[PDB]
Amino acid sequence: VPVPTGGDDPTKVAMLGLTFDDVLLLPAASDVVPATADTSSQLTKRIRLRVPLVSSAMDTVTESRMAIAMARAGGMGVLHRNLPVAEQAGQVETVKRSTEQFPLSTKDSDGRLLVGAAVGVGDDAWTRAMTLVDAGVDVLIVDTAHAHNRGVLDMVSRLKQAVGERVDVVGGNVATRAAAAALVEAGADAVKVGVGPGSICTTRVVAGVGAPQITAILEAVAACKPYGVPVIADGGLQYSGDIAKALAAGASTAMLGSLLAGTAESPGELIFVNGKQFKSYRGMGSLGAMQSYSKDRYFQLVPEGIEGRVPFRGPLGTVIHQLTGGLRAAMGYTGSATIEQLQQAQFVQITAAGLK
Amino acid sequence: VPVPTGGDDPTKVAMLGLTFDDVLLLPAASDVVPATADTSSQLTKRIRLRVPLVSSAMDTVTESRMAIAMARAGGMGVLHRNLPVAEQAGQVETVKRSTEQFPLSTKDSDGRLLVGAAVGVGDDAWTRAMTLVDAGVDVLIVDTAHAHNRGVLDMVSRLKQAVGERVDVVGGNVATRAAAAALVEAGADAVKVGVGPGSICTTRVVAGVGAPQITAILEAVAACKPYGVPVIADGGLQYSGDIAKALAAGASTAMLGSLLAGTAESPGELIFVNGKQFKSYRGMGSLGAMQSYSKDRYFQLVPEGIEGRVPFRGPLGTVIHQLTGGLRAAMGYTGSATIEQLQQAQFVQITAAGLK
Amino acid sequence: VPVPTGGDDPTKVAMLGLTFDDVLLLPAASDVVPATADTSSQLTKRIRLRVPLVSSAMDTVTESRMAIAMARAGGMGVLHRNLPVAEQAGQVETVKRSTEQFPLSTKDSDGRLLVGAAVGVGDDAWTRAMTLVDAGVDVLIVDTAHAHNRGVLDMVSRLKQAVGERVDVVGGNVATRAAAAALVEAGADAVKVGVGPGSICTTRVVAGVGAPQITAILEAVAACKPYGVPVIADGGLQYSGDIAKALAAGASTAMLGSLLAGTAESPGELIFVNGKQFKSYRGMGSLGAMQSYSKDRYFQLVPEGIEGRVPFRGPLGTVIHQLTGGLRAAMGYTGSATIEQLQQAQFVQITAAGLK
Amino acid sequence: VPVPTGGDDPTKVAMLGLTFDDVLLLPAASDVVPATADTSSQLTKRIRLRVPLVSSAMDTVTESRMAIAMARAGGMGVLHRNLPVAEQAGQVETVKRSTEQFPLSTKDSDGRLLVGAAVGVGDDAWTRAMTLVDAGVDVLIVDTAHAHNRGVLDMVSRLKQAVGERVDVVGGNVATRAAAAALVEAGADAVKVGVGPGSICTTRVVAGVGAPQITAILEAVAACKPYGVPVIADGGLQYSGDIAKALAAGASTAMLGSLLAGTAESPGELIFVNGKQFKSYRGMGSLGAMQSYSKDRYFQLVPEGIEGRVPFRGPLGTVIHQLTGGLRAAMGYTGSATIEQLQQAQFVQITAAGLK
Amino acid sequence: AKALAAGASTAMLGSLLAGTAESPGELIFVNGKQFKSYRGMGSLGAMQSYSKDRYFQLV
Numbered sequence A, B, C, D: 001v002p003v004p005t006g007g008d009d010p011t012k013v014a015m016l017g018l019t020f021d022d023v024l025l026l027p028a029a030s031d032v033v034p035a036t037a038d039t040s041s042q043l044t045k046r047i048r049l050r051v052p053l054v055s056s057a058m059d060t061v062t063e064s065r066m067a068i069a070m071a072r073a074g075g076m077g078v079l080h081r082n083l084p085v086a087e088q089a090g091q092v093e094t095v096k097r098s099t100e101q102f103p104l105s106t107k108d109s110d111g112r113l114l115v116g117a118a119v120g121v122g123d124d125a126w127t128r129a130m131t132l133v134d135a136g137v138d139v140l141i142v143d144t145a146h147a148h149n150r151g152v153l154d155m156v157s158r159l160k161q162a163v164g165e166r167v168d169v170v171g172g173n174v175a176t177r178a179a180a181a182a183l184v185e186a187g188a189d190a191v192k193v194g195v196g197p198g199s200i201c202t203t204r205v206v207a208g209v210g211a212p213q214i215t216a217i218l219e220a221v222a223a224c225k226p227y228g229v230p231v232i233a234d235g236g237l238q239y240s241g242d243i244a245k246a247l248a249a250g251a252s253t254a255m256l257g258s259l260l261a262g263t264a265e266s267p268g269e270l271i272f273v274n275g276k277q278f279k280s281y282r283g284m285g286s287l288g289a290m291q292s293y294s295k296d297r298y299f300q301l302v303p304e305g306i307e308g309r310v311p312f313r314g315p316l317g318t319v320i321h322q323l324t325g326g327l328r329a330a331m332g333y334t335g336s337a338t339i340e341q342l343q344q345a346q347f348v349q350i351t352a353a354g355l356k
Numbered sequence E: 001a002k003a004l005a006a007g008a009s010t011a012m013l014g015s016l017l018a019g020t021a022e023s024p025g026e027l028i029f030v031n032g033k034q035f036k037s038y039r040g041m042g043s044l045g046a047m048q049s050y051s052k053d054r055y056f057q058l059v
């Protein structure tokens, strides 16, 4: 009579959450050469990227240099907001002002590289958003840790009402079907997915809140797809196989953090330790980062992130090519000519024995 | 026809038990700022704490100093019984006799700090209980390792009949629905839950007996909530996320052990090892502690606890503030304005890959 | 339509196996003081031990001294058969020929200590069995690695027909319900259970054959209990909690290996390694031991055991007392007055998180 | 209403995959002595081996020396294709041209040793295959990493139409039932199974594509057995227990990789490190290996293999005898007189606790 | 060369010839490297017995 896990409510434990390590992609009938697979995918309803990768809006990942490199490589970059508004507007202008080297570069109708900017929630965030739109930003990301708040939805609706035809609006992080549906109703052009799985995240330890990434992507797609709203899987990706898994679950774009932090185009000074090279990497909720403009990320001290260092990886183009090659190999195995065909692939669930 | 795990009796393996690491809290529609969340909760049917934390009744955790500090911090402290009756009454008097900087201090009707005392089962325990009641204790915890015993229920009934109208009576550790129902029938004002999950506990190794804490809390709550009897989750809490999970499973109060052992207010001398500071922490059933007043906890040699050292943590106030901040973050994520609403949040079960 | 794990046959994967680490004993309504619990249990249909423990028939565990000590401690010892017949008969007579220090000692009608001996399968084994019966052994264990063989069953029937009224015959190791039923029909007085779970055993690695011990005990009890044939759990036991778990699963007696090899009474010299005292421990199918009278254990060199060292433990009485204290604690928690009541306790299955 | 793992599509997560560590062979009624079990099994529809083992077609495993040793031991060897066509034909001729020491030697009608050769896909592969056939090869393995491609099936049909009555054609790696059915329809004489589980493979990390080996064998066998097409399990085998499990899942032959890289007959110079003997072992798709005949395994840089060193194991005969002894022990435990009876054995699934 | 220049006419060699293949003893393999035993006549391994009169002898 009672639930086998305890209690009487069958919905007290909502579901069983799968992460990236719990699944593998099953091979299927393939007539696709990996070199000819089309990896282009929608970022928003009006923007299509040649490479379905986006740089995280973190102070140690994306600034003007990284944004330009990502835009040339085929993706896009989202500039962080841990700095004064005028400085972020200056970064946007630097990206917009900056031929055959980069056939995959992403550009607007005027031939200038695309760039995205992150804003918060509030009147100061409204002034920031208006300044960024005037500077010529292409897409605005309403970056909040928990986007199912009333204020986040109201801010997304106001931005779409004001500058909804000039720029695109992307909702904050969600992890459930209900939150994704609420963001879609508000009018977001895309939905960003993930609450908890960050590598530098301590939400699961400090707050005891989280959601495994594969299940969260599936639930959000289950709410976003009938309306044509793309999904951006944000956080938890460590290999190119994880990117392929995230895209096969229904996500149209993957946002990268630590995989791009150690590159040469990321900010921060290179550090030398015992003959090896490393670079800093900290979360926006870490004590060092919030000791400011971005401290309002979690409605603030109880830090919800950690600082660390990741090894130097070299130029960004090399990392992007490795990830795209892994994705192309996955597409060849699953017989997916396009990303829209990769989004229909099947998974096999593996036990703990397959991971040890 | 036969059970998949073996045999022919489907009730031989009663249920699948979930621990704190098996679940995460799912985000929900939130309209709550962490700084404005109300963390007050019921300890017994008549006592309400501003911070739902209670100190463990262990000789290395709670004495007069720790009890005063916990009562000032917004919670309460329970004095151990590993000492003669007169000394425990002296500790109670010291706490009661004892500052505008503490707005959250828990006080009785007369403005004196609240304190609790732990008693066992027996005629000596009855004399101890009478002395503590005369000394002015607020709550008596009938502390036994197995509270489903007949004698424990009889002692709880006797205490309620004698001094029930003056003090509250909390019943010892249970791990099933039937035991919680029996304690409620006996007349306990609150039920303490947990058999096995202690950090220094070896009941699972020595005796092979235990119960995962999340499932035990769910079962005990299903037994106690229809009568309005609060639940105190005791043991196994290592982070503020665990406190949030325990309160979301249904528990109204959490009792803290090793998290409080390394603070300044805890009894014990400071240990210096290689320039690092540690403090002693041992179970009340260990060889070094039972060698007596607590030796009768399991009707006793067979040690059922271990000794060890925990790193020095500093003042109690800092630790309590960090734990309460983590709890507030959880309340903000789940959209719970009060603890009574946090007790209705949903879980997501994660696999082994989610713990790697 | 197909099986979720693969193929179309739903019986290809017969069941899910639970080991000792997958379950815990659930506390129940108790009125039992651990000191007054009765640990007497049936070894065979006619022999009742004061302590439900038996020594393994291994050349590094049991000889005359260990058998004498075990019989005095309240259990019984089984002499290994890795030696000539005359030597084994001499060991039996040494035990039989050998005041108030040992009230729990096990004895026959003549007041002499009970002892058991292991025999193999064949004609030399028949001569060995007859010589041991003449020497005065009380129970014969037909020790084979796989007792579901036709030859082992026929040997058990022959022994029961010949010396049935003088000694008890215990069948070799089984791991399924069908094998237990086959041994019961052949006339065995006790069924010894376990194929794979030995600590020094490499059957699961070399042959890929095994069965988890909790499930195996449940399956074998489901066939032995209706006819009153006791079950002896052999192998995989590391703590007193495992002994309690094996007895609660239905076993009436546990056979101990490595828990007794490091004691003084076990054969072998005391090895000194970096100032620490160890003793040798090896399986009867190890390359060292099968180079011999135990070579017939696997119808055989393809070693199926390993050699190693176990720390010195001291006198056997102390180890037996520690194990019995753990068992008594389990009986107190589960509210079991006798072993027959312990055999009806319930398990809670734990996940992988509960083992980290 | 939704799927418990997320979304609304029940077929998104197709199945739960089992690997070798997840299962164990259950003992059954046995009349089989390990030394008298028949280990002969089919390789193709016309070739029967005495030992059901085949050497891998890798540049660090099999050449003329290893092929001859495997053919003398009772198995077979498949020559790698990372060298010019004339060189591979020379190796085949050397094997075909190279008394009672080897009673189990596998030979054709003309008394010469059997040998197999690996070919790719394309016109150059067609020329290679015709040259090898003109050199007297016995079986051709159409070797690809993903055999569900249209080109692979067409190549298999072409080879069977051309030289189908002289040599046998084995289809490359598959992991599902549909792929095995496609290879069977294409005319393959045997189907090789496994995509991902190689020890030197990085397909699961780079591409996120894979299939657990036990489940893949079960599915492929369900596809092939009604038509009498043998299944060769390739990859993931680390012990003789794994070989026994692979054969019990339905496979007729296991192809060995790292288990044969440290043998004396394996190509490559012996390497000394700190007085210990190791040998190099690398995949056919590794960066060093493809730096151009084998570069086309995955339609290729994005490496999908790794390099390393494995301990030197000595002569091949010793390893083959040890593996066969483990297989014989499994046959004795499961009561299987022949391999066709071992293929009907049952499994027991074990939990993670059984692996710790 | 120094010994011969000091005045000696011949040098008698010990350990410089112990490890040659023509010397008595068994080859020892340690971590893949080849060694040979070499002991003094007064050593405990050698004087434990003939040739105990080397120094009128156990120290």
Ligand SMILES: O=c1[nH]cnc2c1ncn2[C@@H]1O[C@H](COP(=O)(O)O)[C@@H](O)[C@H]1O
Residues within 6 Å of the ligand: A056, A057, A058, A197, A198, A199, A200, A201, A202, A234, A235, A236, A237, A255, A256, A257, A258, A259, A282, A283, A284, A285, A286, A304, A305, A306
């Ligand atoms: O301090 C933080 N805590 C939690 N999540 C963060 C923090 N800073 C950024 N994030 C998010 O978590 C993601 C982690 O990316 P990853 O390191 O690639 O897993 C980032 O891309 C952000 O979306």
Ligand SMILES: O=c1[nH]cnc2c1ncn2[C@@H]1O[C@H](COP(=O)(O)O)[C@@H](O)[C@H]1O
Residues within 6 Å of the ligand: B056, B057, B058, B197, B198, B199, B200, B201, B202, B203, B234, B235, B236, B237, B255, B256, B257, B258, B259, B282, B283, B284, B285, B286, B304, B305, B306
């Ligand atoms: O010796 C002991 N054995 C088992 N449990 C104990 C012992 N001493 C205290 N406990 C309980 O275990 C809890 C451990 O708290 P923790 O250290 O926060 O897990 C205490 O609060 C007591 O409820």
Ligand SMILES: O=c1[nH]cnc2c1ncn2[C@@H]1O[C@H](COP(=O)(O)O)[C@@H](O)[C@H]1O
Residues within 6 Å of the ligand: C056, C057, C058, C173, C194, C197, C198, C199, C200, C201, C202, C203, C234, C235, C236, C237, C255, C256, C257, C258, C259, C282, C283, C284, C285, C286, C304, C305, C306
């Ligand atoms: O060589 C061997 N191979 C496999 N099992 C063995 C061997 N020797 C003893 N055993 C079994 O393992 C038991 C002891 O296991 P332990 O209690 O884990 O040491 C014995 O009672 C036998 O049933």
Ligand SMILES: O=c1[nH]cnc2c1ncn2[C@@H]1O[C@H](COP(=O)(O)O)[C@@H](O)[C@H]1O
Residues within 6 Å of the ligand: D056, D057, D058, D197, D198, D199, D200, D201, D202, D234, D235, D236, D237, D255, D256, D257, D258, D259, D282, D283, D284, D285, D286, D304, D305, D306
């Ligand atoms: O470069 C490679 N990458 C991945 N798999 C490979 C490669 N080369 C060979 N294989 C396959 O992986 C298997 C590895 O065998 P194992 O080391 O016994 O698991 C081989 O027998 C081939 O079937």
Ligand SMILES: O=c1[nH]cnc2c1ncn2[C@@H]1O[C@H](COP(=O)(O)O)[C@@H](O)[C@H]1O
Residues within 6 Å of the ligand: E012, E013, E014, E015, E016, E039, E040, E041, E042, E043
């Ligand atoms: O046990 C011994 N003690 C002292 N001198 C020895 C002993 N054995 C040999 N010798 C002498 O010492 C010399 C050592 O020569 P070397 O090996 O060139 O140093 C030998 O050639 C002998 O003359």
